[PDB]
Symmetry: C3
Subunit: 118 residues, 3 copies
Amino acid sequence: SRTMVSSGSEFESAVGYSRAVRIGPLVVVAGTTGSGDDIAAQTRDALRRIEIALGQAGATLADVVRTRIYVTDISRWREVGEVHAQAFGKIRPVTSMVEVTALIAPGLLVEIEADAYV
Amino acid sequence: SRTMVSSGSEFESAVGYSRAVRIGPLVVVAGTTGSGDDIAAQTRDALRRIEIALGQAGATLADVVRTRIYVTDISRWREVGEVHAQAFGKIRPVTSMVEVTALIAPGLLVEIEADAYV
Amino acid sequence: SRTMVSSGSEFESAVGYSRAVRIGPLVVVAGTTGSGDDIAAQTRDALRRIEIALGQAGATLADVVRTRIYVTDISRWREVGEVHAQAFGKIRPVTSMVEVTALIAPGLLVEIEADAYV
């Protein structure tokens, strides 16, 4: 039995995708970006939205087994890591962080995916 | 019990990988590129090949819970989204779309992965 | 019941993540880079570390269903493929290989993720 979470955004509309999908104990979360002027704020906001999507799929951050982080400037990995650490210091999912040339819009500095179990 | 799908390509040969693998209800699909001259045609063809690989693993597009899209020019996200939407408007897996510097060959404009359940 | 593997590195410290996590039959492995001067050596070393993390989570390379490979120069895909092939010629998980602008440090030429089942 499959459940899906939508945020009502046009982008989900134009591309045909969900914020989160749950089947069995698996919950997957879409690449998520954040509001905010700088990389730290955007990371916090991206993680807040992941939590919101998770919670609507009956999951919490404690269920997250993997995150994947795309940044436009990996030299700023520490600003991003600090926020990920404040969110996942106990939980400690696996992650990756790689630099990409661009995200969907030029002001967007970080995008985060998540996989959760349970 | 594990089943694997091969397309017989040299690349699978040189790198040692499968188009799709199924164990339990999980089916994972390799990064897939498409034939065609422009981003729309390549997206459609990449999705056709994903379907073919899925079907050989006993799965359909309706089982897909996640896609991940790499593009060489994210300013063309709409051409790609339209095709993803025509394929997944009802199903609505989660996705991500990020721009990369290059794919395996210079004429290749888009690559798509998929995860499916069931 | 969840188990996690740590390597004791500062980076896991700063970012708050695990080398590997297992729940149920799933084992996910973090993006992994390798020591060594050139792309071949770094790929071999990245795969050795994946194996080590897997083994500490009760898994082997034969359980791997997916790898994902980030390289800084995809024109060198053959050097990387040869090593992946020597590791996975029989097993044949699905993969993807894409070029990124940078990894976490400038001398790092390849990063590999893995998903395993069982």
